[PDB]
Amino acid sequence: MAGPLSGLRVVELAGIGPGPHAAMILGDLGADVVRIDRPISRDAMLRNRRIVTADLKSDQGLELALKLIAKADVLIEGYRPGVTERLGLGPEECAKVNDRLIYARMTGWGQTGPRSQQAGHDINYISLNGILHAIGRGDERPVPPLNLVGDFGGGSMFLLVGILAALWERQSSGKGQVVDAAMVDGSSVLIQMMWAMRATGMWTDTRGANMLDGGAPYYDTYECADGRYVAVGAIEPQFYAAMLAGLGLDAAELPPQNDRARWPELRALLTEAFASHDRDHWGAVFANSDACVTPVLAFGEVHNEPHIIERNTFYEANGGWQPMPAPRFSRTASSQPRPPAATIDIEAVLTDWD
Amino acid sequence: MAGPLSGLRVVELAGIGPGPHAAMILGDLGADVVRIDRPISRDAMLRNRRIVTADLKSDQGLELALKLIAKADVLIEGYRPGVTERLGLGPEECAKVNDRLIYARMTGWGQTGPRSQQAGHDINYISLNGILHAIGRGDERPVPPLNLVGDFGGGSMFLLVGILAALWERQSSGKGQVVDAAMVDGSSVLIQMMWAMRATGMWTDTRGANMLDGGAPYYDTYECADGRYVAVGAIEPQFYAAMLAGLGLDAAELPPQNDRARWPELRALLTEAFASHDRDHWGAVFANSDACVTPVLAFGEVHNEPHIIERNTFYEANGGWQPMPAPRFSRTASSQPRPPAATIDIEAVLTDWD
């Protein structure tokens, strides 16, 4: 198996959302991941796995799972706190068979506290920590940024960091430990820049009136003549200048870039200019420039974009594109992910693993 | 220094956005991070560092930088590709003095390809890979989800995963290597669940008309009587039922949860219900059940929320709150972050580092 994590052994207890995303990336980077499900997937997320089944409620299934775990470097579970405990797969039971184990617990609310036993989804975790409030236009109710911030950016990505950090630790202690990855925590560290900026007046709690939330005319999307969109990210003055130059707008006729009182005016002039030609016109105009103007591509156009083609950011799988592994490694590179395959015998995996 | 990365040595070449956020998390987890800037910060992001200065364009500063890199495990740089090369600090130069170095390159577009020399910001990277298009209400232009998805979720977080994975590879190869972390790549892997769902009919390219983008009446925010908001995330039928009960709605008088044709009707009945009382009323109705209803808190209210208080997700600093380290480790726990302190002499760090 190719990649920097070649040799690493991971048991994943089948769940939804952040846990399988974390397992996927481990497999992408070359880890040997074995997912235990209940008694061929068309879910591309289950790439780079071997799937086995066990009833964790039976004596036989518990025993087979504990034998797998005994040979593994990492366990990923995403149930409610207390669930693995009651199954006999809790941290203390795993430690008896394998004290080198990195026991990774993926939850929204965390292992303890008043909400720890309560159901939730991404939108709920980001509603409690100020994140969701900060997303969307100021004249409307907050919009969910899909499940990118809670489930993934502040969820599976923190599980991954904790797993890999604890493996580093084990190189010198010889021992594993438990990683408590709560999406409410991870997402807060994900948005630390905004917490930093609040303290210095560089960010306000007012929705849609900051530099990065759509409040700034030079950091937003604009609708073009064809009803398609461009993104403008021209924060730095020399980038802003390049953007005006391509629009053919005279700076001396516009409000200054950062005169906030005239941002309505500035936005209306930029709106009119971008609305005068189609999206693809602006790709030609701004070619090879620092104007920070890009087309807003829909998913179904992405694979035709030259920078995406040339870098092989995606690969073609089962009637659709899927993202290639990230990040990239110069010496031990990842390969194209292996598709989901048929279930296999758990006894066969133990034998492979010894 | 407390945490699982105690003993790790990191040189950070001062930059903005993704690079310093990755350095921050390494520090938060115990790494010994030394940031080289140009010749006391009030930026909480620069916590858990030592700051030194050097003019990398001069013979003396380059030589001092190279001596630091000689002793480090990890180098973080976020300039345009080619910049460290021309300074004398490219991967091939650093390998000469330290072949165990993890050379970590944080860009938007990546090290190669047609856009790789062009300026940009978060909004631009997520415009090119279909993510930005997918965010916001269907009747308005796309809204940026701040810089959470490109800079951090698909940016620093993949740089971290690359660093830590390469450290694992290094344990058996005895060598480091170069990590190419491009935001356009990382963010695509962050959104892999949507790429999966597109291939199985579970996601459309139509904006604002999906299960997780605000298209579903049971996965969105609602405005309450006081003009404040709740978030509803009641996907599963049992969670949906608990939500209807809290609202005092009789299920028999509503359309079925997943009768999409009647989702306008359902949303209108849900709108009217939530509008009848203020946010904190619903926060109390729904405080314990599995209804998946949470109050939408603004940043300045977060620290008063019980679940946030009890788990110490935040700590006080400067004049406000900052997130504590995440994720959490049961044996080698992180400490409260150290604030940015005064600059120090580079030669002293070299002494300490031997």
Numbering used by the authors:
A (entry chain B), B (entry chain A): 1 to 39, 45 to 359
The study reports:
α-Methylacyl-CoA racemase in M. tuberculosis (MCR) has an essential role in fatty acid metabolism and cholesterol utilization, contributing to the bacterium’s survival and persistence. It catalyses the racemization of α-methyl-branched fatty acyl-CoAs, converting the (2S)-epimer to a near racemic mixture of the (2R)- and (2S)-epimers. The enzyme enables the conversion of α-methyl-branched fatty acids derived from cholesterol metabolism into forms that can be utilized by M. tuberculosis for growth and persistence within the host, a key component of M. tuberculosis pathogenesis. Within each active site, the large domain contributes the catalytic residues H126 (part of α-helix 3) and D156 (part of α-helix 5), while the small domain contributes a third catalytic residue, E241 (part of α-helix 9).
Crystals of wild-type MCR formed under a new condition [0.03 M magnesium chloride hexahydrate, 0.03 M calcium chloride dihydrate, 20 % (v/v) ethylene glycol, 10 % (w/v) polyethylene glycol (PEG 8000) and 0.1 M sodium HEPES-MOPS at pH 7.5] after 3 weeks of incubation at 22 °C, and these crystals diffracted to a 1.65 Å resolution and belonged to monoclinic space group C2 with a dimer in the asymmetric unit. The unit cell dimensions for this new crystal form, where a = 181.15 Å, b = 79.16 Å, c = 59.24 Å and β = 91.15˚ and the diffraction resolution cut-off is 1.65 Å, which were selected based on the CC1/2 value and the number of unique reflections present in the structure. The electron density maps for both monomers within the MCR homodimer were of high quality, except for residues 41 to 44, which form part of a flexible loop region. Each monomer (subunit) within the wild-type MCR dimeric structure has a large and a small domain; the large domain consists of residues M1 to A188 and R331 to G360, which come together to form an open α/β sheet structure with a Rossmann-like fold. The small domain has a distinct three-stranded antiparallel β-sheet core structure made up of five α-helices and five β-strands from residues V189 to P300. A surface representation of the MCR structure shows the extended binding groove, which is made up of residues from the large domain of one subunit and the smaller domain of another subunit. Within each active site, the side-chain of D156 sits parallel to H126 (from one monomer), which is hydrogen-bonded to residue E241 from the second monomer. Sandwiched between the D156 and H126 residues, a piece of electron density corresponding to part of a polyethylene glycol molecule (from the crystallization medium) was observed. A network of bound water molecules was also observed within the active site due to the absence of a bound acyl-CoA ester.
